[PDB]
Each structure stands twice: as C-alpha cells, then as structure tokens.
RNA sequence: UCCAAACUAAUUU
RNA sequence: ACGGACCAGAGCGAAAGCAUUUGCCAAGAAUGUUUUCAUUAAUCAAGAACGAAAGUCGGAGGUUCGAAGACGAUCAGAUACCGUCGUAGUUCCGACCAUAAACGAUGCCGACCGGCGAUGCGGCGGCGUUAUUGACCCGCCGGGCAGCUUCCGGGAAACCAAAGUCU
RNA sequence: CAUUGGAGGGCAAGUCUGGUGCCAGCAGCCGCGGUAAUUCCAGCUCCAAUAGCGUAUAUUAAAGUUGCUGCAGUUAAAAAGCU
C-alpha cells in the first residue's frame, strides 16, 4: 500500500514535468508536502499552487513553470549532522552551483543552504534541482 | 527467443484448455492451438452434378452438403499445406485469406 | 524475347518530344527521320529505335503517354485546367442543413441568416458497419 | 553564465521553447521558429511587425505543437478571445 | 482574428462553407482535434465549428505573409483531389507547388536535382502527405495542414480543421486561404469580391470532364 | 573552387554569417564540410581513434571493409566525431573527417566553485549513453586534469574541458560505443537547463530571414 | 527489490554475510579446504627431493615435450 | 510421408 | 468410459484446474450505497491448507486406449518409427506422494505516465426499432481478460504502455 | 666499466642478421615454432625503471565481479506451484 505520501507527490510532479504539462494533481495533501512545495516555490521552480479542501486529506493543483529537472525523495529520512552534509551534496546535487537538499530541522523544513546559516542538522526529506 | 506474442495459441485468461485429437494423425493438441478448418464441401463433386440431377426422380432437388469441422496439429497442417510459413512482419496478420 | 532495353526506350522518348512534328505511322519513313536527327552508331540499333517510335505514335495518337510531353496534348488539357463555368457550384441559395447545423450557426451568431432549409435528422442511429 | 566579475563567459545563450520552457539544443532539427504576422487594427494589412514563437521538436513530435502555438497566440490576442 | 470586425467571417462566406460541406467531419475523432469540433450528429458525423476553422485559417494566412520571398512557401498535395487547387494556389500567391508524388530526399538529399529548401509547408492531408511532413522534421521547417477529425497532428504546426475529403471542400479551403493571403498583403482589396469564382480550384473527375464536352 | 549547394552555404561564403554561434542558435542542419573549414579552419586538429576491420561473409570468402573513428575539434569548445566504413584505409580516414565536421557541437564549460577566471570544467553532472556504455562527467576542481580512460580523454581534451571526473559503465572494450557515449555526454551540456538560463529568450530573426534580399539575387 | 527501512541493518548484514559465500575468491580463502589441499600449505615456496625426471606432453595445438620433475 | 549411415592424426592463407 | 459441433485470443477459480439436464448445499468477485466499525494495513523466516500427470496402497469396476510383453513388417542391424494383439494403468470410492516448459520462462501491495477500437460483468443516461421488464441501438462510469497503435520512456537487442518513471 | 628486465599484441621498444625446423623452447593471457620465426637460441641495435630490478605467495584498489552509497533475476546465472 501507500507507505509514503511525499514520495507519491514528488514522483507525480516529476512525471508531469517531463511530459511538459502545466498543471498536476497531488493527492493526499499533508502539511509536509505543502512545506516542501514552498521551499521549491521560494527558489522559484514551481508556480503558485492551489490547495483544495474536501474535509479529508485534500488535493493540491500545482502550476509548473517548466524549470524542474528532478524532484526526488530520500527514503528513509536519514538523520544528517552538519559534519556529513557536504557528502550528501556531491551525491545528490548535479553541481555546487545550484540544487538543494531539503532537510527537516527543528526550526522547520529547510533547504541545505539555510541550515548551514542556522547551524543545525536534521532529517533529510528529499531534494530538487 | 520468443517467436509470437501469444504462444502460438489463444489461451489468455485461463490455465488449461481441454485437448482434442488431430483428425489426420490423432495427436493430442489443445483446442485453441489447433488449426481449425470447417469445410462445407458438396457431396456431389460438380463435375458429377449434371449426371445426378438428370437421373433424379425429382426436378427441383437441391443436393445436400457435408459439414466436417477438421482439426490439425501444427505438423500435419504444414505438411498438408493448409498453412505456410510467413515473413517476420507478415506473421502479425490475422485476417483470413480471401475467397 | 523482343523486349527493348533502356537505351532504346530512353532514346525513343527524347526523339518524340523534340521532333513530334516530323513523325508518322510509317516505319520506313521514321527510319529515315531517325538517322537524320541523331548520331546512331549502328543500323540494327536504328531499326529498333525507329521501330519503337512508330509503336509509340499510336499510343500518343489515342491518349497521353506517361513520361512524354506532347505540346498538342499538354497545352490543350489546359482547357481542362483553366475552366470556370458561368455559375459557381456554391451559389445554391437554398442549402439543406440539419438542426444541429442550424443550432451551431446560432452560437456562430448567424441565426438571422437566410433560409438554409433544415432537413429532418435520421432517427435510426444505424451508422456503423457490422463487425 | 557569468563569472563573479560579471563577464558573460559563454559561447551563446540557447533558445528556449516557448511552450515547454526547455532548451532548444544544437542539433534539435525538428525545432521550429515561426512568425505570425501582425496586422493593423483598421484595414488588416501587414504592417511589417510579427510575433516569434519557437517550438522544440519533442513537443512537436508529441503532436501538441498545434495547441501550443494556438495558446501562445491567444495571449497576444492574435487569435480571437471568443475562440 | 484578433476581434477585429474587418477580419470577421462576413456571412457571404458561410454559404460557401455550407455549400461545399466543410463543416462535416468523419465518424471517428482524433483526441487532439477534439477542441475544434462542435458536436456529433446522429449518423456519427462530427460537426466542425466554423468559428474555430476561421481563426486558424486566418492564423495560417498570417504565417504565409510573414514569409518574405513568396516562393519560400512550398505547397504539396499528393492526393488528386487537391492537386489542381495547389497549382492554382501558387499561381496567385507565388508559392512553390509540388503536385503528385513527393519524391523522398527532396528536402534532405542536397546533391540531387530537385532539392529545394523552403521556409513553410502547406499540405492537404496529414495522413496522405505524411512523407514531406516527416522530412520537414529534419530541416527546421514548420508546416501548416488542412486537417479532418481523424487526422494525426504529429508534425502539424498550424492545423486548419476542415473537410479535406470532398472535392468541393478541399478546393474551397485552398481558395479561402489564397484570398486571405492577398488581402493581408494588400494586393487585392476586401471591399469587393474577388474575381476567381472558387470552383476554379475544384478537382473535376475525368469522366465528369468528357460528359460535359458535348453539353458545353 | 568550392561552390556551395545549400542556402546556408551561400550566406557563409558571402561573409554574411560571422560565427557558428549564429548557426547553433537556430539549430540549422550543416550539410557541407567547408562551412566548418571556413570558420574553424587552421584551428582544428584531427585524430584517428581506431581503425577497426569489419567483415561480411560472402559465398567467395570474406568481404573485409575498414571502419574509421575520427575525432576532430578545436581546443576551445567544439567537438565532432565521425564514423565511416570503406574498403580502403585512406578512403575511410578521409571520409570520416567530413562526417566528424558535420557533427561539430558546442561544449558549454562551467565552474567547479568560486567562478574566477575562465570556465574550465563541465557545468554539472552529465551522462552520455550509447550501447551498453554510459559515461558520466563529474565537475572537477581546477588543477585536477581529466581523470578518465584514454579514449574519452582524447575527446575531452579536444573540447577544452580541462577538468573532469569520469565514471564509466558497461563494455568499454568496444571503442565505438565508448567514444559516442562520451560524445553524447558533452553534446548535452547546452541541452541542460541551469538557473543561469531562466531569463527569457530574446528572439533574433533567422539568417534565412534577415538575408532574404542578399540571398535571392545570388542563390536563385 | 531490497529492503531500505531504517531498522533493516540485521537483515542487510546477515544476507550479505550469507551471500559472500557464493563467489570463488571468498570461498577458497575462508573454507580452509583449499588451504588443506595445496601442498605448500599456505606458503610461497617449499624444498623437496627430486624422485624422477618426467616428460609431460603439451596440450594441443602445442606439440612439445615439457621437461618436469616428480 | 518407401528406404538415405559415416567422413585427415599427417597441421602453415 | 466420454460429454462433440455450439466453444471465442470469451468466463470463473489462489493455483492446479473447470462444459449434458435438473435439484440441494455452502462460498465468492465486481457493481450499487449520503449504512456500519474507525487504522483494524502491506509484505512475510518458522509453521499451515491446496497442488495436473505419472507413481504407491486398499476396495469396486474394467468399454476404449495402452508402458511392459508377444508377434508382422521395414532395415546392414531395428530389442525403434508403422501394423496386429495385449498386462499394469486409464474409471470411481478411501488413503498417500508434492513434483512439471506447475510459463506470461515476468513476486506481491501502491502511485503516476499516450491514444484508439472492441470485449465481459454491474451501474447510469439516451432517439428509435421488437416482444408481452427483456432483445437490439448510441454513449458514460468502475473493475476484468485481451488487442492495435505510438520516437512516453526504456533495453545487448528481440521487444515492453510495462520490462517506463535507473548514474 | 651499472645493473635488472624486455622488444607480435595488451604495453614503452626491430618485419636486422645467424642458427633450430611443432624439435629444443618461449609464453601470466591471446599465442609462437612443422626450412625466408617481427615471439625460440644467439649477435647487433632499441626500450623501460635505475643502485636497484625481476620472481613466488597472502592481500587492497581495479570490482557497480558482493552492490549501504551501487548490482542483477522475460530470453544471458536467476521469481519459491499457489495461497
Ligand atoms: Mg499448466
Ligand atoms: Mg454438447
Ligand atoms: Mg516457508
Ligand atoms: Mg495425481
Ligand atoms: Mg488399486
Ligand atoms: Mg507399434
Ligand atoms: Mg494412477
Ligand atoms: Mg521446481
Ligand atoms: Mg528486468
Ligand atoms: Mg609485450
Ligand atoms: Mg578487490
Ligand atoms: Mg569503485
Ligand atoms: Mg553482475
Ligand atoms: Mg535461464
Ligand atoms: Mg510462477
Ligand atoms: Zn497431426
């Protein structure tokens, strides 16, 4: 069955990206996905996304700009210290110039450049570039 | 390697079809694999129809037919030249030969 | 085994396109023409080229030949090409349409257009071939 | 694209498909760049101006370049809004 | 095209489209041609929306006027119902006609005799003229196509939803297209009708020719 | 004595196109060798990668022809690769330079980090794929050099890629699919969309369009 | 495929330790049967006594007599 | 739908 | 003993497998649902039920066919192919046995990703035909067995809408 | 008084000369030798690393050929008969 909601969300965004579609349904909306998409949206890879409330786990319609190469998840959510973070950088990211590893730290769901500034580790959710 | 997409037979949603016997040599063939040939050959051989009809005690007597459903194994149907071998792209063709 | 090769069939077609005005239905006449307008190296070839021109002259006389442009035939199928009748085929002034054809014209905003007499649609729905 | 001094260190900036926002590559020989003529608002004659759209070949092999140019021309209002 | 009342349909032209039968489509429907269709009838025939096919046909005309050298537009019909309309199209607009069999390598084989490099292709039928559409995807060459309900729109870049099956409806759509090229260039004017009488472009059958030679 | 036979070949010879960048912007199909000789001539260096013999069995013995792998490209971001089979060695080496010239692609160079000076390595992790072979190109730091097998090293040096880490996979003992998978990798350094290229593309008009007047009195 | 979960280290470590035995270089360096079978006994060299000069014929296509000692 | 088996150790392209 | 033709790239079953009529017994999928419970789930070492054919052990029965066996041919030979007989077996009832090219040579649960025409079951809607709620017709929805088509992508390729979403 | 290994290919370096004639021998691997040996035995040359250099054996990288990162399992080795 469905064990991981974030994985089915990012696989469906990734499949619609290479099909060249403009919009995509994301079924069940959790709050972890919403906090994941905003980090993708502040760095500007996706457009505005509409969240639909249906008195259960809702749906999200996402506008795609056409900028995304690959949004992936990492399973399990390995705990990552700041010592080991740069070894995840050259295994997930295509370059040191762009791309982000998304962490969930105690100060919230962060990309990896923000976690160095805040000096905290966390569990890894996924990545996008 | 695999030669045909079905495996030379028409078994899709079931496990085991009952077998029949080849009418030429009595080999056990599954029912969907066998080359079926329904023949409605006349019993008269139309070289002879103008002799049977002139010798009849009737005037309008339609001569009967002969309804035989033949079965064949793959060995006998090739040897009897019921079927032939086809090219690789021409195997993917299920329309029967015209009349 | 009288099949004529490509060097006879290609040479005979270029003769007729260049010299259609001289050729006729006599072999022996066109035999003398074909040596006059051409450098043919041998006499036995000359009879074959002239023998295939005269064969083609009957086919040209009845109709057109695939690959041969006859200026009598090419310029006078142009009347077939440049033809306009006195009335168009489109100006009919009463055009049999369907109620669905008419109802689209309302969404096209031409319901105030002239007649276009509607016909009753068929009630069968029998439009597919039996499988 | 550029080093931190500000010098544009590139050979060229490639075009992006105006329907899928992906790079039209160097040997993407199915990728078109068409022009839609502009008419003046009075007589409907060609004024000399035009809109340029580029459709990459993968969108074109998809068979969706028809609706793509049709949507890119409804944003300029070249195609009527009441389509 | 553009909500300009000078570029609208002018109902004179509607009686042409209904007399030829351009609104009629096939009994089956391509999924990418779905947006141009109004509604299916009772006999399975789909009805093409004439507002949709007017906008694309004017969109197609803007693509030809954007070509500077008029012979850079090449026009192809392999099917005979349309070979007459293509020749008379390029006679007016100055295009480059290819009637009949399209030999392959015409756009790719740069050493042979008939090797012309256009900038625009306009064809009659995507299924019948699939070979130059396929070769136009090698040489960065956008194509406009007359299309029916069942046409595969693969390398088609501007589709004109019409009836490209009837003889009266192929030639009319070539006639309406040629008229809107010369009006947007300003060669002919749009305050008065054009002197061509659109059945000049219609394909006439060979038995239809000889049967009226004694009538005319 | 070179007379061009293409519309693009006429505008090149008449000093109207100034670099290959005006061609590569519009993806124009190069079909003539001299167009590459016109711009990049006396800067290209060639190299034969391998002469492998191929054989066709016939009813009278074997019909051996010779297949030629030719690398080409100046050391500042252009690489071609040409394969041609002929009955003779010199006949194959000549003709495979032409096919290598008709496949000159641009190589986007990038920075490893701290973008100081000229771009020296691949911009990001790219991966070619040909046959069973996939060749990955990882951006190296500055004085690293090209840490690779000797066959793609001859391709990566002729692009002016100074720095790369290379991962390979599959049967690299065949040189043909291992040269092409390298060539497939560096030919998609421009195909990849970085954040540097999100700025909208201004459309310059096409060279078949901005010379319709010079072209029609000369090429026609 | 493979189990990926966060507590599957024992399943992964034991499956690995069992599947190490299925290749030749691990199997002969850890059974001790092959260590029991070579006459050096895990050494590089050995001193012996020549009993006999023996002629060994070469495998085809080679056709010589390889001079060996027993 | 009659029978129908075998093939230098003596090597060099 | 066996259930032809009807009988299909049709159905059902966890698989093996399953076809004369009628009755009885218990089961079950799919659909329908603005019912109920409220995470009860997914996959699974150990363990467990089922498992063609042949074979084994008891009873019953033995028509056909038929290992072994006996002959007639063919053959250089022919303890084989072909023919004529014919044991065990094939049939049923009660136990065993636990393997098959037990194959889609493709674990299961879940998500996303092109079209199109059909088919089977259930539901819903719709001109009209036909019979005294069915039969046809046109679609829609969902599960199912499949097909065609595609430069989705993949693959060593053959090929696969999964063997795709994998440097 | 500079050796140790080589010179068909992998792999840097000879179609040199003389002997031997599937012999003696070489050769990690593919191979060479049955009378013109680019491979043996020698001379000449040449190469490599050099006061060091071959050889045997354990072992690490190569090995994404043990795969956590990172392998496969339709037909190449392989998904248990089914639950
Ligand atoms: Mg079975
Ligand atoms: Mg029955
Ligand atoms: Mg068990
Ligand atoms: Mg049994
Ligand atoms: Mg018994
Ligand atoms: Mg017998
Ligand atoms: Mg038994
Ligand atoms: Mg088994
Ligand atoms: Mg697989
Ligand atoms: Mg060596
Ligand atoms: Mg190791
Ligand atoms: Mg490694
Ligand atoms: Mg392996
Ligand atoms: Mg196997
Ligand atoms: Mg199985
Ligand atoms: Zn048989």
Numbering used by the authors:
A (entry chain SW): 2 to 130
B (entry chain Sa): 2 to 100
C (entry chain SR): 2 to 132
D (entry chain SV): 1 to 83
E (entry chain SA): 2 to 217
F (entry chain SC): 59 to 278
G (entry chain SX): 2 to 71
Task: Give me lines lifted from the publication on this model.
Recently, we described the drug-like compound PF846 and its derivatives that target proteins by inhibiting the translation of specific mRNAs by the human ribosome. These small molecules bind in the ribosome exit tunnel in a eukaryotic-specific pocket formed by highly conserved 28S ribosomal RNA (rRNA) residues. Surprisingly, PF846 can also block translation termination of specific polypeptides. Taken together, our data support a model in which PF846 inhibits translation termination by first slowing down translation elongation before reaching the stop codon and subsequently blocking NC hydrolysis from the P-site tRNA, thereby trapping the NC on the ribosome.
Interestingly, the major population of ribosomes in the cryo-EM data adopts an entirely different conformation, the nonrotated state, with an overall resolution of 2.8 Å sufficient to visualize chemical modifications of rRNA and tRNA nucleotides. In the resulting maps of this state, the small-molecule PF846 is also well resolved, along with the protein NC, P-site tRNA, and eRF1. The global conformation of the ribosome resembles that observed previously for eRF1-bound translation termination complexes, consistent with the structure representing a stalled termination complex. In the structure, the protein NC is well defined in the ribosome exit tunnel with an average resolution of 3–3.5 Å, allowing us to accurately model the NC conformation and sequence register. In striking contrast to the NC in PF846-stalled translation elongation complexes, the NC in the stalled termination complex adopts an α-helical geometry spanning 21 amino acids (residues 705–725), followed by the NPN motif (residues 726–728) in an extended conformation. Nascent-chain residues L718, L721, and I722 contact 28S rRNA nucleotides U4525, A4419, A3887, and G3883, and residues L714, I717, and L718 engage in multiple interactions with PF846 through van der Waals forces. In the present structure, eRF1 docks in the mRNA decoding site, positioning a highly conserved NIKS motif (Asn–Ile–Lys–Ser) located in the N-terminal domain to recognize the stop codon. In the present structure, we were able to model 4R-hydroxylysine at residue 63 in the cryo-EM density, with the hydroxyl group hydrogen bonding to the backbone carbonyl of asparagine 61 in the NIKS motif and the side-chain ε-amine hydrogen bonding to the O4 carbonyl in U1. The positioning of eRF1 in both the mRNA decoding site in the small ribosomal subunit and the PTC in the large ribosomal subunit indicates that eRF1 is bound in an active conformation. However, rearrangements in the PTC and ribosome exit tunnel could explain the slow hydrolysis of peptidyl-tRNA and trapping of the nascent chain by PF846.
